[PDB]
Amino acid sequence: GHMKYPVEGGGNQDWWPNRLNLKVLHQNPAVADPMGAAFDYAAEVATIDVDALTRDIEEVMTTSQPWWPADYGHYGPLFIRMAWHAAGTYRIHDGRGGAGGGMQRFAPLNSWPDNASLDKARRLLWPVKKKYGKKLSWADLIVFAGNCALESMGFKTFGFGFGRVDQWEPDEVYWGKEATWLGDERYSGKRDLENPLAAVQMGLIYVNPEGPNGNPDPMAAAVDIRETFRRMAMNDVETAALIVGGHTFGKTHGAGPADLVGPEPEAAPLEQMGLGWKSSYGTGTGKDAITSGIEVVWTNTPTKWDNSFLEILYGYEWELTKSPAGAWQYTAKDGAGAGTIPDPFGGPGRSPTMLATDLSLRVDPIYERITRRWLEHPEELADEFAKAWYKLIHLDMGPVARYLGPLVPKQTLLWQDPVPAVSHDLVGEAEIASLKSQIRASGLTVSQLVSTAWAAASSFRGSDKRGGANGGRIRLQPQVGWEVNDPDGDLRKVIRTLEEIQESFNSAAPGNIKVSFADLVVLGGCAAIEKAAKAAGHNITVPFTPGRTDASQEQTDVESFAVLEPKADGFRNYLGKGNPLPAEYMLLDKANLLTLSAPEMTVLVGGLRVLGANYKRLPLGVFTEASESLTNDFFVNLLDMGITWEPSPADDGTYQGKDGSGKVKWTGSRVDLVFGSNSELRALVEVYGADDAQPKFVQDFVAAWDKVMNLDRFDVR
Amino acid sequence: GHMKYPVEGGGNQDWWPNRLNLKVLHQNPAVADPMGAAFDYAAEVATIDVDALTRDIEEVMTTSQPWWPADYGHYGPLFIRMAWHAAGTYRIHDGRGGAGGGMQRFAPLNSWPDNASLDKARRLLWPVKKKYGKKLSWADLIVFAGNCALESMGFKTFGFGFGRVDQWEPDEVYWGKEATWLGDERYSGKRDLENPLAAVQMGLIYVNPEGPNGNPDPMAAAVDIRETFRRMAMNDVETAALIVGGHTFGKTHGAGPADLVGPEPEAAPLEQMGLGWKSSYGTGTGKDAITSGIEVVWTNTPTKWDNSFLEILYGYEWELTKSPAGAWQYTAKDGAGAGTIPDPFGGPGRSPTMLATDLSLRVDPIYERITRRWLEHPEELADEFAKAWYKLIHLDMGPVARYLGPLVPKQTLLWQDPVPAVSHDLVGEAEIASLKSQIRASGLTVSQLVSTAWAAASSFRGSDKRGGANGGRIRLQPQVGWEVNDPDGDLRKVIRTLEEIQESFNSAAPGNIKVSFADLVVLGGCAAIEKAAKAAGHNITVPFTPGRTDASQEQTDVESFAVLEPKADGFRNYLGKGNPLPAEYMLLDKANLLTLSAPEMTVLVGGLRVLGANYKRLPLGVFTEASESLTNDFFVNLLDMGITWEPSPADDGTYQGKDGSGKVKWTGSRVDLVFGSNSELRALVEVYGADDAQPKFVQDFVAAWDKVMNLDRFDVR
């Protein structure tokens, strides 16, 4: 290699390529954010004139620009594409991707080959952003532009939520191992796609427009479509709807040779003002645009919603052919339909053309059955597409509470994981006290109590904001029978006891107050923690925010929740099979998902260990002599040089810690030892392990607990 | 390559290795710091019982530990070494390194080859840290241990300052281009060392103990010593003193084969608890320790200060020889002095032994002259050593105001860049107003006025805290004749006018109030900025903290200040010759040195441009129609897509920006264009470029100006 300046990207990952990267816990730091801590986007966007906004976007769409002139004089379709690529990175495995951070404007995504030209697309909207300033995020604007495009070309959309917060440095996501753009080192078996990924190649949104690995076989392309879309939460109906609806607008761009297209934005030179893919071919823009290399124009009404796409697809026979840049497309057999497809810049007509993936929709059995139906019933398409699209651009916004502004529809949807609205008066300070008492009297140990509250709350992920302790989904499928949550243990026992306390309280009922199961689960941990803190000479009181409600099993899509099952929870010292990296990297990814900082992550492991939140209540990492008592013993003992650590002879990624007389005194996993071993983590352990550290540990621990308990609580935030 | 998970170090620098790393401007982020914003180290350390602490460290030094047992039963010398390696990374070129952040405890430094065994040393102190908690930083403790070591073996040290604040993630410093440990790709010419580096090889503190490139030639080794020490601010006397004083204590370690030493801390396995270099040789510790591979014991009194080192060096003749691990050392000719040097663990005696670098001190003309003197005059050594050591561990603490606790000596020293204490009453709210008025009336333009303030204040560097607008050093050598500051321009003119206003006010004098020249320079910019703000419809008032005093040329080591001359200041659109990377990376480095965040960097470039802070008052980047008026025009115009950018035909790393009619309307440097071209910077530009942005720009700009005006003001902080 060759070490570089830090200003030029060099650092410690250059010496030890595989070390833990603690930087994933301080993504998008306050200092980096020019808005200042005062700033509350929700507050700003809810003052926004939506009509004025729509009018301003419409004006942009219909005002062509020298530096990237507009197909058919209307940018709408490009804006639709844009919005789709914005939302289309989302994947269900980890909730990462999606249009929620406006990440498309930063690396790597701003320079993905599949996002060619979208740089131009984004730039075009600056005039709108200029006008709205802080009241409108890029995150919100990019997908809204796509939604206004649909409107302005006569398709009525189902609604729209504002509220995506802009970020100031790019979100670090794992996009695959491939070191080259468009590479494919991500399949095995018949055609099994590497988790978590939901594209077929590096730098693609979903599938190859020319079919798997460039091979234009529609039956084969469908398998990839089906699979990648499933992993972006779209089933068969939604998928079909999405592509047909999509390609009812605009056209592709492959006017001349692929190799006359310069380098992508991050590699572009300075005078290009952050715009890449400059074309030496022709004018290089407009008439001559090379984006994807393909040259299809799907409908004869590229800037209007109607049924041509499905009509064209079924109303001809198709034969293989090559774009002016040598790309596989389809075109109509025996020169049928010649001249009926209009030119983007008033040239002559053109023949009916289609992507290999478009034919999938007629050639695959399931896609056909669906799309033939909509050929004779377009108002069914217009309905399904309205729905899919809405879901597509809202998938990663989590709880419906977050959706903002005039256009949010009245109706809730299953994939929003909804929860009943608060229907009664909420418990006050007195009933809270009262209940806490009752919960300790219930004979549920601190261990069960905390184990449970954690199990509930920690199901959350910051990525798409799904999961959490709201909804009380811990008692429904599939959460109630997750390995890590342990059904074999006593979770059912704990649930039952808690429901009983709920009912009791709910008869007693002072006035019109009721308590939900969801609140009670969380309250339980809070009570337990209060107890465990006393049992080690502290009178701390753990804060609690009531308001959670209880979902029915009907409001809970079992299949959808599959993806939140922890395969690894270092906080509960759980590690089941098939994680990509060893235990400790899993811990970090998990902390990153819970929106925790390294300090927060540290104290939680500390506290959780000694409260015996541990899975199967194993002794690993429980470096205390005391039972169910909240102390920093974890930290003090971790730092004890009188203990000597070796891997267990019974080889199984666990370890023994012996003292001066050779007795095994402590055992522990990798997740436990990495805190005393990694120099950054050990630095933190030394803070909480000092002699003066006790009250501060208890404080910081509670502050963190309470943070995790509140992660999904957008309803009050 | 092979892309990794972010949790495992992968990111965007993998796709474009050489892109700008804006992460250097958010080093050590608040969220990562387990202390919380309330925490005030100054206030904690100042409550520490220093005697108790000395006692507690003494007790550690003399209590040997199984896992790394103590040479001669006293750890002192190891602590000395440690403290030396802690301070020893510092280099004058950029002020980076030094013991001030306690960086030795993190990567890369914790695993430098030269830092072998120091992991053990640090760990040995945990018992102390444990006892003092937040009242004592690892930064302060590591060097203090060294100083207490010196005291406890009977050498009286000159004083000690507390106040180094611990940091939570490692400072990203450029250590050289070498991809292998101990490599050397850093020389050229006769023996010219690559700036900024001050070591001969990668992972060395100063020089090779076996002489240049392992070649044990003393006259040659001395050239390296002279050179590297110079670049760590030591001259000839100081250097000699340091090594002799140093080696009056302890021994080296090379008991058996070099290749039986395991991997260094960062690459060590988990059960080692962050300790590297485990030895399979013998017990691997103590009697058998392998650290550097060499096996020298310099004096016969390894744990006592006296004159043996110099006596032994001069009182024998030396012949080449090899350590048990095949390292070049010297030993006494014709078996003289056999058995007289004692064993670390009560073995038999040993012969007089020396490093090749030790002989340098006798063999080099200049070192010989100096050391022969101290052979007959040990009290002069004891005096010089006391002084160099103090300077060594205090070099990077900047202003003497920061030094803390009972042990700071009374006397000031030239290398501390001192400034007169405040000898009068300071100007209050009215005199400030009054003078601001007088400065505008002076007919100094906003441009000169700001250019100057900036030139003064921006000489600061956060690295070793040297530089700044305190001391009014702008008018003395060498600052007054710095290319970038422009002597050919009217700096003299501005100085003179200012001195005049100083004098006038000083006669007028309401009671016992005086104003310094330093305060006046700063005040000047603040008035100018207040003026330029009005001239664009804003009544903002710029805050100002009086208290700066004026240094004499006697208090100002000209040669020392040489290193602070900007070879590049993107804020003044200045770029002179011989910087390692292009204009824009220099900008970032400079911002990092000024402790600025990207938002801060951004608004400053914006404001400075339009106030015509530009060097040689060049038009580059001045994207405004208005003169000396504070607006966001820079930002608005940078985001104007109506302008087209190309490199000047007159090829010189500048650019032309033309409009719709082909006329050059704007010109600019790389430093200017990168703000519209790098996606993260462009994101910030877009905040300050919006239509609603005007007041917020002015606010944030002032806030940043005021921050830079105050960088060196530890006297009031």
Ligand code: HEM
């Ligand atoms: C099977 C999955 C899909 C594939 C393989 C695919 C592929 C493509 C390609 C290659 C282009 C040409 C880009 C260019 O050269 O300008 C394109 C354009 C376009 N795509 Fe799709 N796409 C897919 C799904 C979608 C979806 C789900 C939508 C929206 C719901 C959509 C909307 C559009 C639009 C509106 C354009 C035209 C943009 C313009 O006029 O510049 N596509 N698509």
Ligand code: HEM
């Ligand atoms: C000319 C530059 C220097 C070189 C090349 C050098 C080299 C070395 C080496 C190779 C060791 C043996 C490492 C080991 O096996 O423990 C050592 C030890 C030591 N050095 Fe130096 N040194 C230099 C300057 C200094 C300075 C300036 C000081 C302090 C002011 C110092 C203080 C010590 C002490 C106290 C030890 C003994 C450590 C122990 O007993 O465990 N050295 N040095």
Ligand SMILES: OC[C@H]1O[C@H](O)[C@H](O)[C@@H](O)[C@@H]1O
């Ligand atoms: O009466 C309504 C209350 O009791 C119900 O049975 C629900 O479980 C609870 O969430 C609600 O607050």
Ligand SMILES: OC[C@H]1O[C@H](O)[C@H](O)[C@@H](O)[C@@H]1O
């Ligand atoms: O009066 C003599 C000196 O005192 C003043 O207060 C100023 O601080 C200084 O620059 C001046 O030369």
